[PDB]
């Protein structure tokens, strides 16, 4: 409800098993590269190393998680507070009008408005994007330590089925915003070319 | 097949309002390490928060689903060896009575 | 293997030598906050590991329906009631061993008899 | 250093630390008790949104407003062409004997004086006035004051 | 904390580089002694008022620094609990005084261990090497760059 | 309320007639964080009343370890008369209380 566009977040554990450095880097919406988690978590507010792996690790014993994290920490040491890692992340972002200044509004932007939308897109929410993160992260680890299996795609549970109300939803929602969109139209038209 | 049905969705925000006067914390002062062993709230994929006696909660939410106050389409889970419990209350999920 | 953190900035400590009294230290890379190390392990990395095998075991497991049930007896507290369950790591190596816990004191063995 | 951060400055003051976080619940043991169960249970039980209505009238008579209907519409909203019409008055050739006196004192007021303006004071039509005012000023287009009608140097530098 | 303290909105720009209180007033010094066409047409997007009233006065996030600059720390709004909580104030007679919240600010301390730039850190995570230096902090802060707020101000005091 | 920012040129002096710095002297003042349930938020909340009437009293065991607040009579028979305090925290740290105040802009 809202706005019915979609954006996809993926998080991606980069290396082989037989690499010596095995980091993972999440792709955010418009900025044309793959930025290591860290650097995602201190631009939400979360500088601290040790707050980082508290989102994503649950448990304090389970050091196995912990040192498949390690390789995460050290890629993301060069920058170590929020305001250099929103810099970080507008530079890559696909703008181009941003000069040096808007970068780091931009990039606060993207990750308010168009990172994991499904949770909230209003100001003051950092906490709740930080968490989910950690939480998309702790699955991906389960799932490559060998603890818990891919999902299987063929899941029913997982799946919707789209039925006449849902499907008309959809083509009126498009056609509805062509018909605003000429209404619109018709009074810059209107007003310019002075017209009844 | 002959008894299958799909939902037709409703609003989610009447539950999550329920599970906040439940006992239902807030994500915003979830300490991991103070609590492991909360059990995660999730409502259509988002996490909510987190909640002390998952039983208690469980127990009431089938209770009012049963009854009628909450919608039969409403989905619930309990995952008790993840910790989790995820409420569903989108369209397009099929479902069938038993 | 532990992870130790700092206490100044919570930063995670990584390991140093000190040629002077030859010892290991663990020193922040930001502020320079050092302390003894108390065990002279750093790295550990198990290509073989057991651990996971009873993960998801909770005060309340024993309220799962799904789960099965046994009459096998518990060598700690002698109850007949109990719920058994296969490994937990999804590795396609380990065992087709059982590992029951009890209803009645929450304690979890297995029914190994080669290694146990 | 950076000379220049543009803060905000604002009155604040502390006052008090908090040392004790509570949980404000009811007690089931009170007689009231049970009502505020009920309130709970009536917060999922209320549907806010209404259904739509559907018209009940003749259906040719609800489209009597709609298509090529012999209705004239009394909206006056964005009616902008309607404004203009309104005001519109013209003057009649004005002589010449006067006008070319006048454009010289209008002209002394400022040195670089635009068509738009000079027709709203002058009231004359374009056609004769572009005659008189071509004789007695030039328009200078490719300067910084492009198209901007100014006097002649000769009664300029005067 | 050094008093005095000021709290109060400013820009998180170039933090690390901000003067601090104590440098201003030994500055102010200082200059005693020298002394002596558009389109005619647009379209304006509906926004509710709450969220851009709040947007607005959320621009500049509070930030509280001491008079030394030893203790840094900004402020950001939270919305999951800011109008859910009470406050009872404790009165000096043993009763109680409460006052309704209005927002909560989350503080984070800033520059405690010469953090870096990011003109630097870009350059130091490209492949500038196989890996930053695990001791690259302590070898740059003997060198003299990369330097704290604190440890600006009190050379430049010292050296007055 | 835009001002200038380093303000090396001394101009707050004439600009404000008050302190532009923060007051750590009602600091030392103990404060109890309360989280209402919805129906007694929806009361308590509201600017329309706080008039410095009776809202309860907050009764506490002599060893301690329970609290509770019983409110008055005024609420109509509708809501429970008695609640109980539970300290999610007994040991509160780093968490205060802080104003915010318009200055004066003459002089
Ligand atoms: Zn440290
Ligand atoms: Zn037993």
């Known amino acids: ?196 | ?98 | ?116 | 250093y950076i000379p220049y951060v543009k803060t905000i400055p604002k009155k604040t003051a502390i006052v008090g630390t908090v040392c004790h976080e509570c949980q404000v619940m009811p007690s089931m043991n009170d007689p009231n008790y049970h009502k505020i169960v009920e309130q709970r249970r009536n917060i999922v039980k209320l549907n806010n949104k209404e259904r739509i209505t559907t018209l009940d009238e003749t259906v040719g008579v609800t489209m009597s407003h709609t298509g090529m209907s012999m209705r004239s519409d009394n909206s006056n909203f964005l009616k902008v062409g309607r404004e203009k019409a309104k005001s519109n008055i013209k003057s009649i050739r004005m002589p010449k004997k006067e006008i070319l006196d006048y454009l010289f004192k209008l002209f002394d007021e400022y040195d670089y004086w635009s068509l738009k303006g000079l027709k709203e004071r002058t009231r004359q039509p374009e056609a004769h006035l572009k005659e008189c005012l071509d004789k007695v000023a030039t328009l200078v287009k490719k300067g910084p004051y492009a198209f901007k009608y100014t006097l002649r140097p000769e009664y300029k530098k005067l | ?160 | ?107």
């Open chain 1, 1 to 196: 409800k809202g706005s019915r566009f979609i954006s996809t977040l993926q998080v991606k554990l980069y290396g082989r098993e037989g690499s010596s450095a095995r980091t993972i880097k999440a792709t955010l919406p418009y900025i044309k590269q793959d930025i290591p988690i860290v650097i995602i978590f201190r631009a939400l507010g979360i500088i601290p190393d040790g707050e980082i792996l508290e989102h994503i690790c649950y448990d304090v014993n389970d050091w196995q998680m912990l040192e498949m994290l390690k390789p995460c920490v050290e890629d993301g040491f060069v920058i170590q507070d929020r305001e250099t890692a929103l810099d970080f992340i507008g530079r890559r972002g696909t703008a181009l009008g941003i000069k040096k200044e808007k970068r780091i509004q931009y990039a606060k932007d993207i990750l308010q408005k168009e990172f994991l939308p499904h949770i909230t897109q209003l100001e003051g929410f950092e906490s709740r994007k930080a968490f989910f993160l950690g939480y998309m992260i702790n699955r991906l680890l389960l799932c490559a330590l060998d603890r818990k299996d891919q999902d299987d795609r063929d899941h029913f549970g997982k799946k919707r089925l789209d039925l006449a109300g849902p499907l008309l939803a959809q083509l009126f929602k498009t056609l509805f915003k062509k018909l605003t969109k000429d209404i619109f139209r018709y009074m810059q038209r209107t007003v310019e070319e002075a017209h009844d």
């Open chain 6, 1 to 107: 309320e835009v001002f200038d920012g380093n303000d090396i040129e001394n101009n707050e002096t004439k600009v404000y007639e008050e302190s532009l710095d923060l007051d750590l002297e009602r600091s030392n003042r103990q404060v109890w964080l309360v989280r209402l349930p919805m129906f007694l938020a929806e009361k308590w909340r509201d600017r329309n009343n706080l008039h410095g009437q009776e809202l309860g009293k907050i009764r506490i065991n002599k060893d301690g370890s329970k609290i509770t607040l019983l409110l008055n009579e005024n609420d109509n028979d509708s809501i429970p008369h008695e609640y109980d305090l539970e300290l999610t925290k007994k040991v509160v740290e780093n968490e205060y209380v802080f104003t915010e105040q318009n200055l004066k802009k003459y002089q």
């Open chain 5, 1 to 160: 904390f050094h008093l005095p303290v000021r709290l109060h909105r400013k820009d998180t720009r170039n933090l690390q580089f901000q003067l601090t209180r104590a440098e201003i007033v030994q500055r102010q010094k200082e200059i005693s002694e020298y002394k002596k066409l558009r389109r005619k047409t647009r379209q304006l997007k509906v926004l509710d008022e709450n969220a851009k009233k709040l947007r607005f006065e959320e621009f500049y996030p509070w930030v509280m620094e001491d008079f030394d600059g030893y203790n840094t720390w900004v402020g950001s709004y939270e919305a999951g609990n800011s109008d859910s909580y009470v406050l009872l104030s404790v009165e000096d007679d043993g009763s109680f005084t409460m006052i309704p919240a209005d927002k909560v600010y989350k503080f984070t301390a800033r520059n405690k261990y010469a953090t870096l730039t990011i003109d630097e850190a870009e350059k130091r995570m490209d492949k500038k090497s196989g890996e930053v230096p695990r001791w690259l902090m302590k070898h740059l802060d003997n060198i003299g760059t990369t330097t704290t707020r604190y440890d600006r101000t009190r050379r430049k005091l010292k050296a007055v």
């Open chain 3, 1 to 116: 293997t532990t992870f130790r953190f700092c206490r100044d900035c919570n930063n995670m400590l990584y390991p140093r030598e000190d040629k002077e009294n030859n010892r290991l230290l663990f020193e922040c890379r930001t502020c320079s906050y050092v302390e003894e190390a108390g065990s002279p392990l750093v790295y550990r990395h198990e290509l073989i590991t057991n651990i996971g095998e009873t993960a998801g075991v909770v005060q309340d497991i024993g309220s799962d329906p799904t789960l099965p049930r046994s009459d096998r007896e518990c060598p700690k507290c002698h109850s007949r009631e109990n719920v058994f369950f296969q490994s937990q790591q999804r590795r396609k190596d380990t065992s087709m061993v059982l590992f029951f816990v009890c209803l009645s004191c929450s304690h979890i063995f297995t029914s190994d008899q080669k290694n146990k």
């Open chain 2, 1 to 98: 097949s002959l008894m299958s049905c799909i939902s037709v969705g409703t609003d989610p925000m009447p539950i999550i309002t329920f599970l906040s006067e439940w006992g239902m914390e807030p994500l915003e002062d979830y300490v991991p390490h103070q609590s492991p062993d909360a059990t995660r709230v999730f409502v259509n994929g988002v996490w909510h928060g987190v909640h002390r006696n998952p039983a208690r909660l469980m127990e009431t939410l089938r209770t009012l689903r049963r009854k009628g106050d909450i919608n039969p389409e409403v989905s619930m889970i309990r995952d008790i060896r993840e910790k989790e419990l995820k409420i569903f209350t989108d369209a397009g999920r099929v479902y069938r009575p038993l």
